[PDB]
């Protein structure tokens, strides 16, 4: 099975006249074996366009953001979702945003509903008087299996 969500922020966060604005990728998971892939463009991958981009959490996908009160808090994903396994590598590179892409697959059984987030934020980059956009991933997990 090659079921896969892809949040590709490459052409979503480039500086434009209306920027900065929020680009949201909503990931709805209520089936087993769903793979999630998030592409966050690297600083310097293209000249000027991502000079001040930023990804949160740095330890994604092992660490994610979750909403406590109004405050986003970093939490271990393996704590929120028991039985989660993360591939150490993705296409022979470290599974970390520092390589430009992260991936993870949720386990075949999830008992508790959970929502967590990633951030790929280019709103602090300026080029030709235009500002980049702020990207956000929301993973919505419903119990399944």
């Amino acid at each position: 099975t090659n079921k896969e969500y892809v949040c590709d922020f490459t052409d979503q966060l480039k500086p434009t006249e209306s920027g900065p604005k929020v680009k949201k990728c909503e990931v709805k998971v209520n089936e087993p074996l769903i793979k999630v892939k998030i592409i966050c463009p690297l600083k310097g991958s293209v000249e000027k366009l991502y000079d001040n981009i930023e990804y949160v959490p740095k330890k994604s996908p092992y660490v994610v953001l979750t909403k406590e009160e109004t405050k986003l808090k970093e939490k271990l994903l393996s704590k929120l979702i028991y039985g989660l396994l993360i591939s150490p590598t993705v296409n022979e590179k470290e599974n970390n945003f520092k390589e430009g892409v992260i991936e993870f697959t949720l386990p075949p059984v999830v008992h508790k509903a959970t929502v967590f987030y990633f951030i790929c934020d280019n709103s602090k980059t300026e080029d030709d008087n235009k500002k980049g956009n702020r990207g956000i991933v929301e993973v919505y997990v419903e119990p399944y299996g």
Partner: peptide, 12 residues
């Protein structure tokens, strides 16, 4: 398509 792109559904 086998992959789905929520921000740009035609892509996948």
């Amino acid at each position: 398509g086998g992959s789905y792109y929520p921000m740009s559904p035609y892509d996948g």
